[PDB]
Design an enzyme around this catalytic site. Sequence first.
Site, PDB file in Angstrom:
ATOM      1  N   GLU A   1      64.534  -9.545  62.097  1.00 43.31           N
ATOM      2  CA  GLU A   1      64.224 -11.123  62.205  1.00 43.31           C
ATOM      3  C   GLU A   1      62.943 -11.395  63.329  1.00 43.31           C
ATOM      4  O   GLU A   1      62.731 -12.394  63.806  1.00 43.31           O
ATOM      5  CB  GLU A   1      65.317 -12.097  62.884  1.00 43.31           C
ATOM      6  CG  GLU A   1      65.619 -11.403  64.291  1.00 43.31           C
ATOM      7  CD  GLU A   1      66.747 -10.407  64.135  1.00 43.31           C
ATOM      8  OE1 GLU A   1      67.222  -9.898  63.120  1.00 43.31           O
ATOM      9  OE2 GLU A   1      67.260 -10.080  65.554  1.00 43.31           O
TER      10      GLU A   1
ATOM     11  N   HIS B   1      70.258 -15.655  56.872  1.00 46.83           N
ATOM     12  CA  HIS B   1      70.560 -14.856  58.046  1.00 46.83           C
ATOM     13  C   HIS B   1      69.199 -14.747  58.979  1.00 46.83           C
ATOM     14  O   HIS B   1      69.144 -15.193  60.150  1.00 46.83           O
ATOM     15  CB  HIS B   1      70.883 -13.424  57.772  1.00 46.83           C
ATOM     16  CG  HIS B   1      71.546 -12.606  58.892  1.00 46.83           C
ATOM     17  ND1 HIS B   1      73.004 -12.543  59.271  1.00 46.83           N
ATOM     18  CD2 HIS B   1      70.811 -12.085  59.884  1.00 46.83           C
ATOM     19  CE1 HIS B   1      72.649 -11.840  60.542  1.00 46.83           C
ATOM     20  NE2 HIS B   1      71.679 -11.369  60.949  1.00 46.83           N
ATOM     21  N   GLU B   2      68.264 -13.984  58.495  1.00 43.36           N
ATOM     22  CA  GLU B   2      66.932 -13.934  59.564  1.00 43.36           C
ATOM     23  C   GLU B   2      66.338 -15.425  59.949  1.00 43.36           C
ATOM     24  O   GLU B   2      65.722 -15.453  60.934  1.00 43.36           O
ATOM     25  CB  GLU B   2      65.841 -13.026  59.082  1.00 43.36           C
ATOM     26  CG  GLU B   2      66.261 -11.647  59.302  1.00 43.36           C
ATOM     27  CD  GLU B   2      67.195 -11.067  57.950  1.00 43.36           C
ATOM     28  OE1 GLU B   2      67.598 -11.673  56.891  1.00 43.36           O
ATOM     29  OE2 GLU B   2      67.907  -9.777  58.469  1.00 43.36           O
TER      30      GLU B   2
ATOM     31  N   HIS C   1      68.408 -16.782  63.097  1.00 44.32           N
ATOM     32  CA  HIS C   1      67.978 -16.126  64.155  1.00 44.32           C
ATOM     33  C   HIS C   1      66.693 -16.718  64.890  1.00 44.32           C
ATOM     34  O   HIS C   1      66.534 -16.510  66.065  1.00 44.32           O
ATOM     35  CB  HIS C   1      67.511 -14.595  63.635  1.00 44.32           C
ATOM     36  CG  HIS C   1      68.513 -13.725  63.857  1.00 44.32           C
ATOM     37  ND1 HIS C   1      69.064 -13.354  64.841  1.00 44.32           N
ATOM     38  CD2 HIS C   1      69.056 -12.712  63.021  1.00 44.32           C
ATOM     39  CE1 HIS C   1      70.031 -12.236  64.680  1.00 44.32           C
ATOM     40  NE2 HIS C   1      70.079 -11.964  63.479  1.00 44.32           N
TER      41      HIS C   1
ATOM     42  N   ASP D   1      73.018   1.493  70.998  1.00 39.88           N
ATOM     43  CA  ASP D   1      73.239   1.435  69.196  1.00 39.88           C
ATOM     44  C   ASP D   1      74.594   1.982  68.922  1.00 39.88           C
ATOM     45  O   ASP D   1      75.062   1.838  67.857  1.00 39.88           O
ATOM     46  CB  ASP D   1      72.199   2.707  68.668  1.00 39.88           C
ATOM     47  CG  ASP D   1      71.063   2.262  68.572  1.00 39.88           C
ATOM     48  OD1 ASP D   1      70.588   1.112  68.131  1.00 39.88           O
ATOM     49  OD2 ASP D   1      69.884   2.689  68.872  1.00 39.88           O
TER      50      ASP D   1
ATOM     51  N   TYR E   1      79.049  -9.597  65.056  1.00 34.38           N
ATOM     52  CA  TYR E   1      78.749 -10.328  63.629  1.00 34.38           C
ATOM     53  C   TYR E   1      80.088 -11.289  63.321  1.00 34.38           C
ATOM     54  O   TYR E   1      80.100 -12.590  63.554  1.00 34.38           O
ATOM     55  CB  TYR E   1      78.453  -9.809  62.678  1.00 34.38           C
ATOM     56  CG  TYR E   1      77.062  -9.047  62.681  1.00 34.38           C
ATOM     57  CD1 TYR E   1      77.139  -7.898  63.294  1.00 34.38           C
ATOM     58  CD2 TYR E   1      76.090  -9.504  62.000  1.00 34.38           C
ATOM     59  CE1 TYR E   1      75.826  -7.060  63.394  1.00 34.38           C
ATOM     60  CE2 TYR E   1      74.762  -8.849  61.892  1.00 34.38           C
ATOM     61  CZ  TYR E   1      74.774  -7.619  62.808  1.00 34.38           C
ATOM     62  OH  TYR E   1      73.582  -7.011  62.832  1.00 34.38           O
TER      63      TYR E   1
HETATM   64 ZN   LIG Z   1      71.102 -10.450  62.568  1.00 37.79          ZN
END
Ligand SMILES: [Zn+2]
Length: 628
Positions: free
Chosen positions: A273, A297-298, A301, A378, A386
Amino acid sequence: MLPLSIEQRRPSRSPEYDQSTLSNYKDFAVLHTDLNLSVSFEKSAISGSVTFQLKKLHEGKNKSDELHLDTSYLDVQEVHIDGSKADFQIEQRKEPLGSRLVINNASCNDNFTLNIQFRTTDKCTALQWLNSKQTKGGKPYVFSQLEAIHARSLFPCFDTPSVKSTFTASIESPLPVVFSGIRIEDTNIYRFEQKVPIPAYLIGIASGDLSSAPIGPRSTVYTEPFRLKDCQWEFENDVEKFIQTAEKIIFEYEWGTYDILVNVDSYPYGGMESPNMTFATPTLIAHDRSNIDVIAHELAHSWSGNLVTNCSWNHFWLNEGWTVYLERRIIGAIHGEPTRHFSALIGWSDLQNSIDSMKDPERFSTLVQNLNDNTDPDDAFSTVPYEKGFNLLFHLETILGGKAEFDPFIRHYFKKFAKKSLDTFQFLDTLYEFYPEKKEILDSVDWETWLYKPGMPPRPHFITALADNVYQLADKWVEMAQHLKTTEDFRSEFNAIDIKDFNSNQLVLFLETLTQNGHSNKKPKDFDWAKFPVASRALLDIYQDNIVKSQNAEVVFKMFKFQIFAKLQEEYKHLADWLGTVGRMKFVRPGYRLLNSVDRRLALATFDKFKDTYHPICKALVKQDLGL
Ligand SMILES: [Zn+2]
Ligand SMILES: N[C@H](CCC(=O)N[C@@H](CS)C(=O)NCC(=O)O)C(=O)O
């Protein structure tokens, strides 16, 4: 105003300190960051200098006066403060956070200009390079991937989402450049400005053979020339509708333009994003617009993450969790509510699979994380922020009276923290402060379970309509396969209109459900599609128009998965040929696993044919998946 269960957890200062940085970010205001870069495909490395204008901040008495930046595998050539060499040291690299750059600031003034010259290393983690054999265009390509803490491997900086800075950039490169900013107007030096403050992780750079075309009044698409004309068409008709749908729910779009970069075919990831330049995968191009809902989605963001940022990686749910929520709000506004609930339902499965599949769920499935300075961010990435995050926000929407009553808080929250960063505690306060009349309602939320307990959250109740329609039809197919005998018998019980109203997710879920032998747990014991080739070949023939002829990558993949599962030997070659046309891990990697399970020889030959057209990481994994 908060419940004790989480007041006890509350830190001395908010935004909570970010353990994942070695830099002393609390002690400065970053007034501006300038990046001066040169790209070398020859050496597969990036060079130049970063220039910060810093203000020292003060608090309390008898405090340290330091200057610490983050670096990971970075070659720090020299350091100038206010136009003068300043002594510096790179400390001994530690894991996972990297190498602290310590700078002896001999200056008097609280305001100074910091300039650092550097080169990326052959161990640089921030950049992804591809050769001409790995692009369809024919020429090379580079793109950045900064989240979570790789920006420190691209340039020395305060590598925490708690720090946001306006940017300027001058990037020199043989091929065209795009950046996470707005291009200003050497024929191949490219200048940009980002006037909205951003954290380092959102910095994006890409360079390669790139063309551009308008996909709307404030949107341009960038991609390889051959693909440009197809990308223009895919986005033309919906990007603006999308942006306005989002502004109408939240508020006005802030960054001026919303642009999309459709990366090269070997691009192995899903999307990213970056402000003013959204990174996308060519697998959106379905030629029928069946895969654009994803662009939501992006776009979301832009607000959740880019405008209002998590202060650290303990609080990532504030970022992605909100994004999923807004994402689904946008597709709900456009396709209706049952469609939003369908996404939710699916998200719930994904969540259950994620948590069932973890090493150490006890730790990584709690919504608010606790990384300290010794966990690699990570490693904490899962479906949890999410979906568990989304589900809290959905639970809140529901118990506070729905969208009409929740929306006002959405706009308040994003306006309050615009261009700033926060932790979970500032989010709860804001919640409480805004609904003083609903204290009864908020207090009855089990905050310990939602924010801090592992495993699945309280189960919600979704409109299961779109799913049930898929499950019904797949069950009926499985049941009919057992007793019908002729291709004309199947044309008598089924027809193309069974699926005419199925959106992409529905088709994908339909094929997936078939390979699971139906949805009813009252499944046949010995059932195996392979044993019913009349049945399975009729399913594909009857639904040829929406499934077989679909050029949507998600549906193509599942069609193949169903074909390999029904062991239709004549299709294996087509799956094999297809694996040479896609680069996404999501498809390529499972692609070969399928194939290998039915024709190891065709698999090994196919890999040998295409192995060098893939992103190196995709080649290495697949190569070893195949016991090579
Ligand atoms: Zn995302
Ligand atoms: N307290 C320091 C100020 C740095 C400092 O030592 N100021 C020096 C300039 S070399 C000074 O002469 N201060 C005493 C004075 O100005 O009378 C800060 O704000 O970060």
